């Protein structure tokens, strides 16, 4: 009675039995799927610390000893004392870690192992959550050989606002509106872009203009910080057989830092706790640059190329998106900042498969996020069946402050 | 019901139609399952109730709903299911079932044609001899010397107990598929095990690696019998490219017509084994699955050394570079033979409309997103940030086991 998966292109039959813990519920009924869709008490707060400390103990494989037992009971005695609890240093490093190893949507998960956490909850004000932030970046952007870390600021408590970041990355390019409809930079961003300018920024008139942090503290307004331009790693873009390319103009940063995402540990929320990998280049090359309502290169890189583009037949969209994204991944290794191609990712990804049936005896994955927005097919998650579910430690989307 | 978003316009529309779907999926709110390949695995009351179902259905598609023949039609299925265990369509609800089967199919990205489909009844025919004359002019109405035609020819019913009329074979027109010393496969390997056993039953194999497999045609309760297709009713397209003046020589080609021969067709609980249907191809098949797949002919490599590309490593992405212009090689070899043929953009962008149309005459249209995106170039297309039900509807199309 458990999903039997098969890949297809090798004729590999596994059974996800870890699913049979899934700790939530989605959208799927028998009668309808809704897998395409991008956005699907004490007693209970408990019940949501007991597993998670049941799971901490048994990876160290220390399952049900005395420190087991007695970590147990002071955790329902501190909620019973206070109305939460605090986790450990090292529960810290497992939950963070475990959240990123069960987020179904993560291709780069083979290395969920290697994480590091920066402990930020003795964080105090706006202006102390900047200084976490900045040394976060310096660590992670590592003059360009990327490594992955995760800060988590003070979790959300009774009587106490929360620690936000606003922006949805630490590294985000403005977005002017222009009167004729048309956005000068980022068009994703001109939301963000508005909060900015109206709580004092002085804006810029460029398509890559690097926005200030707002940073809001316990019950006080979000404050405008400006990320010093020497802590930014920016790569310029260009092709290696395309000279015109370059005249573009074209720029991409180094470090993906997505910074508005609730982690979820043990029933504890943080919803403060930004987190970085380094990029895959169809996330720069495709979603960033070609998407119609992101920067929307492709036409105008297809005429430089003199496809035909009066027809889909000829095919032009899709030579010269191969061609953006050999752009991308050329400019990444010239200026020796870590990238993985959408072939690699993928093929990684399958061994991370295979070692969670052997770990956990399966791996939450959701193919429509897994398979990368070109190329599907050539790579080799296209052929694998897969089994989208929840687990907890978790990330999670949450609503904007505003 | 389902608020469902397309990103690229910001567009909600509700999902009214899915609250009909009977047939459950393999998903449950624990854990979705919407990539598996077969979801839905592999009495007189429970036809009756499918039959009446779908009589009704019918009379209010012509307008005139209830009253008139329905009632008649309803005892006479009624006095006939009584009967016999079972009931007989009238032509033009077999007609009707027809294209409702194709406009529920949630995988298929061809649906805006689903109302010109051709019928052909074949319900009265007896031997494997009546049913290969029935095919082959299927394949040559269906074929039209290039410019194809939608089509599609039901075989009679599955009579209770006793054997079933059966096409073996997946397609009407496949390449076959010989092993060796090695262990590798020469022409399609796909088709291995249908030429394993047109060898076993009376063929004679082939030299080279695109060799038109004989159709294994079956009778109630005798064994098959296999019949050569003339080899002019078979049109081929040599490939070539626009501009790399040596893809011909590689020798590559397709044939012009795809037509599935092994799906089974329900309609009103009445489930039709064989019922070959075809339309025309989406160059990305072609071009990306049947040559590009490492398990089929797996040309990828091939071609990009000929392109001069850096096999060595990943991110030259030479796979990607050769695969579009094996579809480039597709599209213009088939529009230069004058065989109909539809681009992965092109079809995609009149999926929408589909979808468009279907809100508003049903509120809702199922479709299976891992399906409907194309292998290659998906978020290029407008289906990509285009958020999608899954669901099923009767009349269907549906798997069925091989007949060994
Ligand atoms: C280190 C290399 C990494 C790579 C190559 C990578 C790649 C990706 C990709 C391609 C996606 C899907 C983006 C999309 O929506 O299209 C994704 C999503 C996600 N990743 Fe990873 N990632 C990496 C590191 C990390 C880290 C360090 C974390 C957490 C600590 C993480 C957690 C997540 C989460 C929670 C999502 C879900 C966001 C969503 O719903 O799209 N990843 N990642
Ligand atoms: C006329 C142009 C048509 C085009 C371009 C087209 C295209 C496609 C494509 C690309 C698929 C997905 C193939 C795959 O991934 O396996 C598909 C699937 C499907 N189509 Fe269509 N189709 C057409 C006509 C038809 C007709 C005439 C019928 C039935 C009378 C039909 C019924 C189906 C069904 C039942 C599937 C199920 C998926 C499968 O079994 O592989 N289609 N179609
Ligand atoms: C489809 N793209 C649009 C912008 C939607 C989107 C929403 C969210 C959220 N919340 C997060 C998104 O990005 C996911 C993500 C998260 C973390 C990543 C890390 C750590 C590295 C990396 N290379 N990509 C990531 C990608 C995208
Ligand atoms: C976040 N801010 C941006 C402006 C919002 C957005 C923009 C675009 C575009 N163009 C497309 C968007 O959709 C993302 C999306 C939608 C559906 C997807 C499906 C079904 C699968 C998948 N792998 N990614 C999707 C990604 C969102
Ligand atoms: C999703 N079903 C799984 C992949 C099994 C399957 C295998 C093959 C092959 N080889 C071919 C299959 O059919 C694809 C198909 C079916 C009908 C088509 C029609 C009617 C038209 C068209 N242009 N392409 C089709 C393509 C299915
Ligand atoms: C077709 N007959 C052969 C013998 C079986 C097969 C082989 C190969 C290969 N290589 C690849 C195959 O892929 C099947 C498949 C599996 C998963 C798919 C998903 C998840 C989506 C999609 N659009 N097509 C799929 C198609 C099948
Ligand atoms: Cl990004
Ligand atoms: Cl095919
Ligand atoms: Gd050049
Ligand atoms: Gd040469
Ligand atoms: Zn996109
Ligand atoms: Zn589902
Ligand atoms: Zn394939």
Redesign the interface.
Known sequence: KF?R??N??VGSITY?TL?AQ?QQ??????????????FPAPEQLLSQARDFINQYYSSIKRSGSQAHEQRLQEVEAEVAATGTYQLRESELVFGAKQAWRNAPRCVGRIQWGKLQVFDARDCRSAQEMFTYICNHIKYATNRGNLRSAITVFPQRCPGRGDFRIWNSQLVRYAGYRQQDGSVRGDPANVEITELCIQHGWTPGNGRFDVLPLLLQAPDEPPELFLLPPELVLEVPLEHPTLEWFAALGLRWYALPAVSNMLLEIGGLEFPAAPFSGWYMSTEIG??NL????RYNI?EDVAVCMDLDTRT????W???A??EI??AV?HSY?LAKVTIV?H??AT?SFMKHLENEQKARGGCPA???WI?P??????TPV??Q?????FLSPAFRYQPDPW
């Open positions: 999903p998966v098969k297809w292109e996800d699913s899934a519920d989605g959208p799927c009924t028998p009668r309808r799927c809704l897998g395409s869709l991008v495709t979603r070609c998407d119609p309502h492709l889909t037949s000829s095919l969209k899709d030579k998106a191969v994204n050999v991944l290794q191609d072939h690699a093929a959701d193919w429509a398979v927005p070109i190329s599907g097919s050539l296209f052929h069946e897969m089994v989208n579910y």
